[PDB]
Symmetry: none
Subunit: 127 residues, 7 copies
Amino acid sequence: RLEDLQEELKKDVFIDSTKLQYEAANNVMLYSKWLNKHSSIKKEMLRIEAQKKVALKARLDYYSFSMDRYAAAEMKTVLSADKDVLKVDTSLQYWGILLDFCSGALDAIKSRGFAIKHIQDMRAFEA
Amino acid sequence: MRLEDLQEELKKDVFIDSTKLQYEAANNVMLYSKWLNKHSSIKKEMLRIEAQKKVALKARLDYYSGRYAAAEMKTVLSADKDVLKVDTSLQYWGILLDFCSGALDAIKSRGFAIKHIQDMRAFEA
Amino acid sequence: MRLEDLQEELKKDVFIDSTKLQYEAANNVMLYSKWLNKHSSIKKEMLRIEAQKKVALKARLDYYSGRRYAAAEMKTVLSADKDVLKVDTSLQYWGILLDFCSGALDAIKSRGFAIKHIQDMRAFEA
Amino acid sequence: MRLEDLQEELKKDVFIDSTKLQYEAANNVMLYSKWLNKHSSIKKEMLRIEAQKKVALKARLDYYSGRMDRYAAAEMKTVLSADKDVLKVDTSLQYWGILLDFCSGALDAIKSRGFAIKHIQDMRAFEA
Amino acid sequence: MRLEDLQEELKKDVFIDSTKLQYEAANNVMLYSKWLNKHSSIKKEMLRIEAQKKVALKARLDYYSGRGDGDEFSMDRYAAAEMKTVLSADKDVLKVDTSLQYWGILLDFCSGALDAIKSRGFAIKHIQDMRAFE
Amino acid sequence: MRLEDLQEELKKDVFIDSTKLQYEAANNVMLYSKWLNKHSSIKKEMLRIEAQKKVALKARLDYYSGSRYAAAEMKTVLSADKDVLKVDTSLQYWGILLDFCSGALDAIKSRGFAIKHIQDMRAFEA
Amino acid sequence: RLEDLQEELKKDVFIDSTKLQYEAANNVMLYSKWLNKHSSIKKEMLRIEAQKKVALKARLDYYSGAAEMKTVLSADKDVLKVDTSLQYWGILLDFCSGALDAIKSRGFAIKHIQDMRAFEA
């Protein structure tokens, strides 16, 4: 669910100032974590994307004598590759939204790491 | 190669030993090297498979052209079993390569984080 | 040249001799030079091969144009051409080498920074 | 000019005389100038050749456009790319482009050699 | 202005008189100014020429499009991609563009120059410190 | 405003009175303010003029879309438009002033550093 | 108003040498003051920027009933007004960035002058 990722990133970006020191190392770990999410979403999408391509050919074959005789009307009833591919594709757009969220997450962590260094510096400035 | 295994490897790599910050700085540059090497080898493989794919594409094009609508050829072939398989492979490596690019970004910023932490320590002094 | 051998060379190069952190600092700039030279020479080679490819392409265009391929297919088929595929494969390979060398130069520049950082942590230890 | 000779020149230039770390520091800025000068002049040459190429392209375009052999226009783009006179001039231009990229690298190199120099000076200050 | 002459000027400028390391430090900032001034004036000129170039391009487009350039007309009918090529070949346009690009080269040289003066200033401080070390 | 006059003013500003190295340090920060002020006001003006230009562009676009201007070429012809060319020339000119002022702020910051360095050479002769 | 920020910074950067001591502490307070200005300005611009996106979408609809769509919409009086505002705040923000740079280095100049005093001793 997207909301759960929103809540997760939200929780993650907050900084504990005394372990501002701890947080610097931990900052790189968030990057890793979200990178992993990123790749897995892409991986999933690729598989589903692959599936859609095959479904299209099958439906294409359906829709467009001498040679075997396949019953066109039962082909139509049984195959429903339109309904099914389209359904799965709707799902795929959902994942596209997730992937866009993960991109936002990495931009966020990179700049959080900078903000962290900045605050450390403004403190050193107060000194 | 498996993407999950690269994920776990990067995971291991990004961890920082606070007591060995100096070591980690040098090893950080070594990590940069390691992932750069992974990167180049993955792209190399993908390039080879890409050549194979260009050939599969030509062969299937021949099949479909009768050597059926001209326009449908693009769709069907894009969907061609053999082509779909080789293309799937190629795209998979493309995903690995993108992961390695992310990895190099990660190591570069880990190196910066390292400098930052050193600074917060000298500040504590 | 082999990409793997450049990988091993860079691998060797990035290793740091801590007592000759001092030596390495000067030696670090020399590494930059070495890889920059490699870098340029690779592009140079690729440019020559690229020129050859352009001629091959014209020949294949002639081949395909009949001087029964479809014009869009002309693009596809020619891209698939054995000879063109071979020369292009080579050219792209060199492109990979070039990208590796770009990575190498980034690597040495930051190794130089890491070196200064370590020097500083030492003076801190003092 | 030859690329390898620039490679050797940069090679010689980047070497550091540690006692004349002091001399080298001043000389370091002079190196920047020298390569900067090389840099602008190569681009200048390339610019002239680039103009020539554009004219050659039009000329070859005319040849190819029928204004000997009859090439389809998208294919005209391909064939003209094959243009021996054009190919020669472009190849040349790109060669200078290679030189230019090398000089950009060189200036980056001198900038950081200057930093390395300060670093070494600091390790010297460290032995104290 | 000539690029080679700017090369010689910068060459002269970057040289350091060590006893007047003191003089040079102040003079170093003055050099920045001098080249900054050069810099801006060069860009200014190029901008004027750039405006001129834009007009030439429209005129040549008309020429090439069969729309005429004064009492002169291009009996040729150019394809738009070819329009791009042919106009790129435009002798008058090529001349003005060549000029403009030349000034662009001068400008890039001046940017390098300002970088140079900035780092000469740094080298100066560093050297002062190495002097104090002895 | 004229660019040359800014060149002369900056020229005057960057000069250092060594005995009032003390005075100059404080005045150096005041210079920053002055040029920062110049800087912001110039961009503000250019922004207003930029708005005017955007309107001019639309007007000329209308003119050109039906003035017989070709649809693909519109960018070129308009780029050459008398009114547009005038307003754009102005705007770019102010852009030149802005870039000069940025250089100026860089200059004052480093003049401040040079000042600290010289003070140090004085503590140094002792 | 930008001019008023110019006058405020102008007042801020002037240095009282005897209260070089006072000024050092007051210097950090200035940093704070302008940092707060800075953040609040970005926040406002961000809010206005959101509004602009909606205005843009509305105007896009208007215009769609494509490249010229981009040109004309850029010319979009309502969009032009909101963008003008947004850019204005961007100018203020850049000014405040300059201001923070100014206070940081004024702080350095103060330490330096303190040192020349230490020099006569």
